[model samples]
Target: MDVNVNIDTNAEKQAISPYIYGTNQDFSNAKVTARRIGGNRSTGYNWENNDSNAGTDWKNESDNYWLTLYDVPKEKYNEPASVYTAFHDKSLAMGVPYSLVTLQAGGYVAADQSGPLANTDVAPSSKWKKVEFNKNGPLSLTPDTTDGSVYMDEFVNYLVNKYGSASGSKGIKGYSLDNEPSLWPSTHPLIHPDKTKCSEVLDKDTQLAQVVKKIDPAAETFGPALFGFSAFNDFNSSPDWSSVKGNYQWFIDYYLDNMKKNSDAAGKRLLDALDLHWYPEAKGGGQRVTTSDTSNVDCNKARMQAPRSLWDSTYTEDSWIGQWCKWGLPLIPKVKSSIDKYYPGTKLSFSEYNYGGEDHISGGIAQADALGVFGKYGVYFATYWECNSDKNNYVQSAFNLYNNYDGNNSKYGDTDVKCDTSDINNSSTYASVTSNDGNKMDIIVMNKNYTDSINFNFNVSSNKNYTSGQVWGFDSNSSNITKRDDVSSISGNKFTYKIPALTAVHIVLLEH
Candidate 1:
């Protein structure tokens, strides 16, 4: 195969947010700039008592699991705001600079770990504690547990008081307004049995956002963690959708418009980023990519090209979403249009996402391509989910390619520059450069061909003189990125290298 990469070092320059290279869980073994503590468990997490409900992810039972999941001192488990302490301490220990924590905005949490909330043990019962957005008086570091309520603002106050403000090194940097509110009725029927309405979502989130901002002005708040496309459409056809269906194209527009109006009244932005969880519906050979099955290479082929749906207007995935949801086929642009039309300056965030097959190279390439798409589209933040256990090594390695390609501190450049390919259908190239350092350029080349190796030619453009280059990559042989020989052919600011089939490479070029 013949391939050519046309690069312009200064074209389309946008600073790649370090927070985009983030994951939902830990990054100590690998490396990421940010980490988040959220999921089904987060919706009902009672930070005051270190109690949480598993919801539909596990047994519908309330338990002390969050307290024991990490290395919390036995005595600290009962201390005031012990849960936040353990989570923040773990992030600090891991050296994750930007961390996000979830606030329970769903109205109730497990009051005890005795067992599952019986059919009768719903909200307003002895088995549950109501959630309040504000104490309405004095914010206390030592909250009153016997008051039968968990205050969301108080949680922020406690973190701010204990660890300083969100802008500080030790304090929590971001807050989420619960997770997947659309699924709340079913995911946590005991606490939030009624279908979450569009009215309530805006009301609760705006209130929580205001309270959070009021308490910690520097903290960035992410909200309405919609589960998927359906939620994006109408908050899962929220009951209020019918009333506003004629006025807005979809819920996204409605949401952004309302959020902007609310922020205008508040005199400052309340919601910092519009957050969502995207589980791709892309399928190949009949099985969904989210299944993570890599047995048949043909079945997994679709995952490699799935990232195109994010930014490519020409490409559409072979999925129900492609066939039925044609208007929003390309997501990121539609979102940008909505943000620009309704609420300008509000950033985009994917708090939870996974392309599947984390155990295989396909997953890594998908992850790599997704990361590139995030940077290309100027997404403010993204944290991968669905990668757990060491089996997810390939996905982690993909992150390492951008975070530590040379196995040292070497990383992808800070600003994104244009790098187009002859054929985007089977390959992709992303180029970047650090503004302060003009002598070096970093490139990521992905070969999506399942059967053919490409004799690739890279055409370069930059103000600095190029002298040498090196390649580091991983393939199906092992889920590890290692250094390879440097590209010796460097003339007229261009070089050539053979990229293997089903491979992702990080190329480093230097003038020094």
Candidate 2:
């Protein structure tokens, strides 16, 4: 099939292609979303924990075991109020929502240092309250810990009173109580290490959900966000969710059941959604199962040649709840199954995803690839972690200054239609489509061929009368993409163009 290529020229045009290029999710009334990336840090917390004599040193930032403690910043640590304010302003500046702010709680250590208090600050009120798996576990909260600490109720009230916008009628959308609570055993020493702080967490979730409703009914919540599930070496044992033998699904199922059994006035569910994370092997791996049953060398080879299509095709065995289960199976459908099984018609958002880039350029392309995945999945929302950065950061966030940047020109506008890349190269051929009336259109096709130039030729056909067209493109050897404002036209119905490799070019057409 001939591909449509060009930017805005005449007002009317026709998109004769089958593939849809617009976002699979609706962004017409668009709002962007971002995560805290890691966690909030404060000078007071930093200074108090900078015990070099005790091994708390500056070099510890890069190394995991340097003994640098990231306790709550006295200024914003445990201070959800300040966190909300700062994150709110920052998010607005970037045109994104401040979702899934991380809280580093349960210091996994003891008297050596102090961290955010969990059970002490957010106690449960239901049958879940007595869920003391072991007094020795990280979930343990000495009664004294609550001496002057805020409880779940108090925190909810504080969050509502402070950040709950009168117009939006919502406080911070969600809170990830602790980072990777599932790995509390490896990360902390407080809880009955063998058993997850699951029960206690469920209890806390129930209380927080209840309190949230009491304050702002419109706001929603999600949690127990899993981290590093794809890395085989990250976990001590097989994941409970993957194995179903541990508390993974058990915790989620129990929580959902109880919330349903005890519905509140609004009948709002305790967990608005479940947060999950995924980090596929950098290269090739299969769907549902990312295995290296082969030798290390063989595994490395597989990684280099892994196919992205496996994820789109693999189907999993069904769960007892009829949810499909697969190890490395494609994510889009699996997400659909989970959503249907747990909360039908309820929305799902991946609170976090790391595309494995050291910085924005390479990492940004990885993110673009992820957007393609999310679009194909038809998901509610998929967000990266943060906004600003110094260099190549993992999950290098979209550096959108929104209305804050100079010029503030748009590269493309809203018009929904898909583009076909079936014949596009596996490595460098990149293409995107944009439309004006959902029929008459503009398509931006980029060819990243390094050694050879790309030749694109197509015709514009419709009941609408023919008109001349315009073309503007970017290339590494030529112009940079800094200004998306070059205007050039195609003389007649027949048109052609070329793009140098390691570069991107957009073809725009001005109609007759």
* lDDT tens digits, residue span 1-512, model 2: 23344322333322221111211111222224444423212101111112111111221121111132222245543233343455545455645454444333332212113233343322222101122112231221112222222234443445556567323633466554444555554433222244354444455556555655555576565554555433212222434334432342434444344444444533766566565555444342222213323233323222222223323453222221113224324554545555566456545556555433323233433343444444434444455542233233212222221111122333332332334343344232222334543322344444423355555654443333334433443333332233344333444444555444433433444443
Tens-digit lDDT track for model 1 on 1-512?
A: 98999999878788888899888776445778888888899888887788889876676788888888766788898786687788788778878788888898888988888766676776778878899898888877777778789888888888888788887778888999998988998899888989999888999999999988988999999988899999999889688789876778888888889999999998999989999888899888888787667996765788888888889999978887899887886999988998999899999999999988898989999999999999988899899985546468888888998978877968898899989899997798899998788888999988888888987898988777898998999888877788877897799898899988888999989998
Q: How many backbone clashes does candidate 2 have?
A: 42
**Which parts of model 2 have CA positions greater than 4 angstroms off?**
1-80, 93-99, 102-148, 165-171, 190-192, 197-207, 230-266, 284-311, 314-327, 386-389, 393-416, 424-452, 457-480, 484-497, 504-512
lDDT of 2: 0.37
Instruction: Estimate the lDDT of model 1.
Output: 0.86
Q: Which pairs of residues collide in model 1? A: none
Candidate 1 lDDT trough over 10 residues, lowest sum? 22-31
How high a TM-score does candidate 2 get? 0.59
